[PDB]
Amino acid sequence: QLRKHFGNNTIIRFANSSGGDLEVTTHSFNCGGEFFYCNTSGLFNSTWI
Amino acid sequence: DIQMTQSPSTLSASVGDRVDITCRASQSISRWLAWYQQKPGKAPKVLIYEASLLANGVPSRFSGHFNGRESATDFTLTISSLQPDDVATYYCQHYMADPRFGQGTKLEIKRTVAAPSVFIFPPSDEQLKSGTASVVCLLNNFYPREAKVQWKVDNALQSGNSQESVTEQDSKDSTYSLSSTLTLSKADYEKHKVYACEVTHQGLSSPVTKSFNRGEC
Amino acid sequence: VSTVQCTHGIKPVVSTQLLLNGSLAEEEVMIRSENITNNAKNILVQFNTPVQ
Amino acid sequence: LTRDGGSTNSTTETFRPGGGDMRDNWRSELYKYKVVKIEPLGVAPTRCKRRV
Amino acid sequence: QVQLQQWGAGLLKPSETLSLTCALYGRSLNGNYWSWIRQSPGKGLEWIGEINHSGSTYFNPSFKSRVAMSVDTSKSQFSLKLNSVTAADTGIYFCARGKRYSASYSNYFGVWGQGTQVTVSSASTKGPSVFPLAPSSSGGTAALGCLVKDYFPEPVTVSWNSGALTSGVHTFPAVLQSSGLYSLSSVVTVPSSSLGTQTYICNVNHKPSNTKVDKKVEPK
Ligand SMILES: *[C@@H]1O[C@H](CO)[C@@H](O[C@@H]2O[C@H](CO)[C@@H](O[C@@H]3O[C@H](CO[C@H]4O[C@H](CO[C@H]5O[C@H](CO)[C@@H](O)[C@H](O)[C@@H]5O)[C@@H](O)[C@H](O[C@H]5O[C@H](CO)[C@@H](O)[C@H](O)[C@@H]5O)[C@@H]4O)[C@@H](O)[C@H](O[C@H]4O[C@H](CO)[C@@H](O)[C@H](O)[C@@H]4O)[C@@H]3O)[C@H](O)[C@H]2NC(C)=O)[C@H](O)[C@H]1NC(C)=O
Ligand SMILES: *[C@@H]1O[C@H](CO)[C@@H](O[C@@H]2O[C@H](CO)[C@@H](O[C@@H]3O[C@H](CO[C@H]4O[C@H](CO)[C@@H](O)[C@H](O)[C@@H]4O)[C@@H](O)[C@H](O[C@H]4O[C@H](CO)[C@@H](O)[C@H](O)[C@@H]4O)[C@@H]3O)[C@H](O)[C@H]2NC(C)=O)[C@H](O)[C@H]1NC(C)=O
Ligand SMILES: *[C@@H]1O[C@H](CO)[C@@H](O[C@@H]2O[C@H](CO)[C@@H](O[C@@H]3O[C@H](CO)[C@@H](O)[C@H](O)[C@@H]3O)[C@H](O)[C@H]2NC(C)=O)[C@H](O)[C@H]1NC(C)=O
Ligand SMILES: *[C@@H]1O[C@H](CO)[C@@H](O[C@@H]2O[C@H](CO)[C@@H](O[C@@H]3O[C@H](CO)[C@@H](O)[C@H](O)[C@@H]3O)[C@H](O)[C@H]2NC(C)=O)[C@H](O)[C@H]1NC(C)=O
Ligand SMILES: *[C@@H]1O[C@H](CO)[C@@H](O[C@@H]2O[C@H](CO)[C@@H](O[C@@H]3O[C@H](CO)[C@@H](O)[C@H](O)[C@@H]3O)[C@H](O)[C@H]2NC(C)=O)[C@H](O)[C@H]1NC(C)=O
Ligand SMILES: *[C@@H]1O[C@H](CO)[C@@H](O)[C@H](O)[C@H]1NC(C)=O
């Protein structure tokens, strides 16, 4: 889908969140009554051609 | 408009030290900031943009930090291990609106003391024929910069009729060079028998004279 | 267009980077932006399948 | 997602997980819904007369 | 590969118009704004304004009353004009690449030209005298060099043996003399053995007068 908006030959890539507070840089969600901040850097580093 | 304040204004550290420079916007810039290195006498070069991303070709020791939130005002550039080449002037700049630079911060490197090798240049006759007969006396590759030079003609103390210039801090070894020129008319030069420069420094044990006597080659 | 007197049930989830337990897109991944040449505006991406 | 604004080579785009404002956790549902006020009174011509 | 070069007037008298040309290499102007920035030691850096391949512009408010910019997409060029110059317009001027069109918050300057120095004064050009600086014989491993004197405006430039000699050179920043004209020296540390083999030439150039000199040092 992003290829449609930005054009077919664009070398699209992901990267993790840059830096700053834990609350803005991470997944910041509640499970079961407990508050989790999780390091999503494992997901966002693919590159595409 | 939105204006940038840097701190500190001047900085020094030794090789292998961490160094931190800070920049503050006069009001919130969401993350639209960049940092530049300027060598003396050259165009600036970008290091960091969006407060935190590296430009291509930047050595990975450079880095940016800020609180990340969309209302930020306070930004930091951290040189995580300083090297002899990092001797330069550093500017932040926002691009929230019209681009405004901060006033710049200068970084000079701290090293061991090293005494000036002193050299004197007896004028070419082509220099004497100017009618402004002049002698150059020179301190090479020394540290710290805080040397001083005196001139003494017929060993009598000169004033005003001599002038100095000082290099950048050398990127290869953090030393400096300083030159002084004795200025005379050819008439005053042709009065006097002896031209002497004398050099004062922290790395010297005692002041060093070098001299030229009219009639020497 | 259809008129209705009430919405479907909407659940007040809270999270940052990924959207959780919300409604999936009908046929394909859909991507939405206010004005896509503006870097200050987030792209919202809605999936067709979940990812567990 | 947020797309970073490099003054860079134009062949590439880098996307980062955006953090985002709290609203987007349910703006992802309220995209389909609009609210309107009825204007039930209206006038139009025709050929009739009130009797007098 | 992507770069720019720039040139134009070096000396201006008060109330004249500055004009500077900037030329790209290795790309077209499309997809980016382009800007001029200037440096002066009393102010640090100032952004003047911006232009694009369409020739539309936007200007820093304090300059909009005196500035103009133009583009020539056929030559890969753009240019700056600044009316009614005063001594306060003295400085170094750089053209630089601005924001990219498809990213509305990207105005940080990735590539810069070599820059050009503008002096705004009534005083006339003068080309340098060049004097060789012979060694003395700390002695035995002394120094030799050249003194460049009474020229205006800056810059002069100095190099050794047609740029073939480089290591152990220093060249001093300029001195404002009693004449109001500039002077400086370039110098190199020498073993007295080298004096028996190298013909020590300083090249000296004063680009504002276009004076070019090759001058030999004498082993007195
Ligand atoms: C998608 O969204 C984007 C973002 O909104 C949008 O881009 C804007 O487009 C409009 C035109 O439609 C631009 O408006 C023109 O801007 C000229 C200069 O603007 C200055 O002020 C801007 C707005 O205010 C901010 O800045 C002021 C201080 O200036 C501050 O106090 C405010 O709080 C506020 O934060 C500002 O954004 C702008 O900064 C941009 O430009 C500089 C230079 O390129 C760059 O450094 C920044 O990074 C940023 O890109 C700048 O500071 C202005 O001259 C022009 O004037 C109009 O009026 C005159 C007559 O008076 C007319 O002759 C002329 O034709 C104009 O009509 C006008 O105001 C706006 O600047 C864009 N914003 C950005 C961030 O780029 C896209 O258009 C949207 N896309 C679509 C398809 O809709
Ligand atoms: C997005 O993705 C990137 C890439 O993975 C992540 O970047 C990594 O971030 C971590 C956390 O900041 C980095 O790890 C830290 O590195 C610091 C710098 O190390 C150098 O300097 C020190 C001090 O001079 C030397 O000791 C060291 O040898 C290096 O020369 C360290 O100071 C940190 O130390 C802390 O952690 C260690 C863990 O063992 C402890 O021993 C210490 O006591 C201390 O607590 C730490 O090591 C990592 O280097 C980065 N990687 C890269 C390649 O840059 C981003 O973090 C990520 N973003 C998010 C939000 O996750
Ligand atoms: C979020 O997760 C990332 C994982 O990528 C954390 O960053 C660092 O990731 C690198 C790999 O990219 C890890 O490398 C290892 O470092 C040790 C350092 O001594 C070295 O011995 C190993 O050979 C290897 O290089 C690194 O451990 C990891 N750093 C940390 C502190 O875990 C990132 O730190 C996480 N985010 C936050 C906010 O901590
Ligand atoms: C995206 O993130 C992953 C995980 O953080 C990165 O994967 C790691 O990439 C390196 C370099 O390509 C791999 O090679 C080498 O492995 C050996 C043995 O572990 C190690 O000694 C070397 O230092 C080096 O890391 C590494 O195996 C790989 N790790 C895993 C767990 O697969 C990846 O590089 C990131 N970037 C991209 C573009 O994918
Ligand atoms: C979502 O879909 C709608 C259409 O269903 C897209 O609407 C777009 O509306 C703009 C309005 O500015 C059109 O762009 C330009 O408008 C000016 C006049 O204002 C005109 O002179 C230009 O020639 C140009 O038409 C645009 O054509 C129209 N359609 C498209 C394909 O964008 C909207 O942009 C879509 N948004 C996203 C994020 O997909
Ligand atoms: C991009 O790819 C789509 C799907 O094949 C096609 O419809 C479109 O014409 C392509 N555009 C370009 C410029 O390649």
Automatic annotation (TrEMBL), chain A:
Post-translational modification as stated in the protein's UniProt record: Highly glycosylated by host. The high number of glycan on the protein is reffered to as 'glycan shield' because it contributes to hide protein sequence from adaptive immune system. Palmitoylation of the transmembrane protein and of Env polyprotein (prior to its proteolytic cleavage) is essential for their association with host cell membrane lipid rafts. Palmitoylation is therefore required for envelope trafficking to classical lipid rafts, but not for viral replication.
Subcellular location: Host cell membrane; Host endosome membrane; Virion membrane
Source species, domain of life: Viruses
Region (CD4-binding loop): 17-27
Residues bearing glycans: 8-9, 16, 39, 45
Domain free text: The CD4-binding region is targeted by the antibody b12.
General remark: HIV-1 lineages are divided in three main groups, M (for Major), O (for Outlier), and N (for New, or Non-M, Non-O). The vast majority of strains found worldwide belong to the group M. Group O seems to be endemic to and largely confined to Cameroon and neighboring countries in West Central Africa, where these viruses represent a small minority of HIV-1 strains. The group N is represented by a limited number of isolates from Cameroonian persons. The group M is further subdivided in 9 clades or subtypes (A to D, F to H, J and K). Inhibitors targeting HIV-1 viral envelope proteins are used as antiretroviral drugs. Attachment of virions to the cell surface via non-specific interactions and CD4 binding can be blocked by inhibitors that include cyanovirin-N, cyclotriazadisulfonamide analogs, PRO 2000, TNX 355 and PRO 542. In addition, BMS 806 can block CD4-induced conformational changes. Env interactions with the coreceptor molecules can be targeted by CCR5 antagonists including SCH-D, maraviroc (UK 427857) and aplaviroc (GW 873140), and the CXCR4 antagonist AMD 070.
Description of how the protein assembles with itself and partners: The mature envelope protein (Env) consists of a homotrimer of non-covalently associated gp120-gp41 heterodimers. The resulting complex protrudes from the virus surface as a spike. There seems to be as few as 10 spikes on the average virion. Surface protein gp120 interacts with host CD4, CCR5 and CXCR4. Gp120 also interacts with the C-type lectins CD209/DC-SIGN and CLEC4M/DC-SIGNR (collectively referred to as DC-SIGN(R)). Gp120 and gp41 interact with GalCer.
Function (record text): Envelope glycoprotein gp160: Oligomerizes in the host endoplasmic reticulum into predominantly trimers. In a second time, gp160 transits in the host Golgi, where glycosylation is completed. The precursor is then proteolytically cleaved in the trans-Golgi and thereby activated by cellular furin or furin-like proteases to produce gp120 and gp41.
Gene: env
UniProtKB/TrEMBL annotation, chain C:
Cellular localisation: Host cell membrane; Host endosome membrane; Virion membrane
PTM statement from Swiss-Prot or TrEMBL: Highly glycosylated by host. The high number of glycan on the protein is reffered to as 'glycan shield' because it contributes to hide protein sequence from adaptive immune system. Palmitoylation of the transmembrane protein and of Env polyprotein (prior to its proteolytic cleavage) is essential for their association with host cell membrane lipid rafts. Palmitoylation is therefore required for envelope trafficking to classical lipid rafts, but not for viral replication.
Glycan attachment points: 21, 35, 48
Family: Belongs to the HIV-1 env protein family.
Record note on domains: The CD4-binding region is targeted by the antibody b12.
Subunit structure and binding partners: The mature envelope protein (Env) consists of a homotrimer of non-covalently associated gp120-gp41 heterodimers. The resulting complex protrudes from the virus surface as a spike. There seems to be as few as 10 spikes on the average virion. Surface protein gp120 interacts with host CD4, CCR5 and CXCR4. Gp120 also interacts with the C-type lectins CD209/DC-SIGN and CLEC4M/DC-SIGNR (collectively referred to as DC-SIGN(R)). Gp120 and gp41 interact with GalCer.
More about this protein: HIV-1 lineages are divided in three main groups, M (for Major), O (for Outlier), and N (for New, or Non-M, Non-O). The vast majority of strains found worldwide belong to the group M. Group O seems to be endemic to and largely confined to Cameroon and neighboring countries in West Central Africa, where these viruses represent a small minority of HIV-1 strains. The group N is represented by a limited number of isolates from Cameroonian persons. The group M is further subdivided in 9 clades or subtypes (A to D, F to H, J and K). Inhibitors targeting HIV-1 viral envelope proteins are used as antiretroviral drugs. Attachment of virions to the cell surface via non-specific interactions and CD4 binding can be blocked by inhibitors that include cyanovirin-N, cyclotriazadisulfonamide analogs, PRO 2000, TNX 355 and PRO 542. In addition, BMS 806 can block CD4-induced conformational changes. Env interactions with the coreceptor molecules can be targeted by CCR5 antagonists including SCH-D, maraviroc (UK 427857) and aplaviroc (GW 873140), and the CXCR4 antagonist AMD 070.
Name this protein carries in UniProt: Envelope glycoprotein gp160
Lineage, opening ranks: Viruses, Riboviria, Pararnavirae, Artverviricota, Revtraviricetes
Positions spanned in the full protein: 241 to 292 of 860
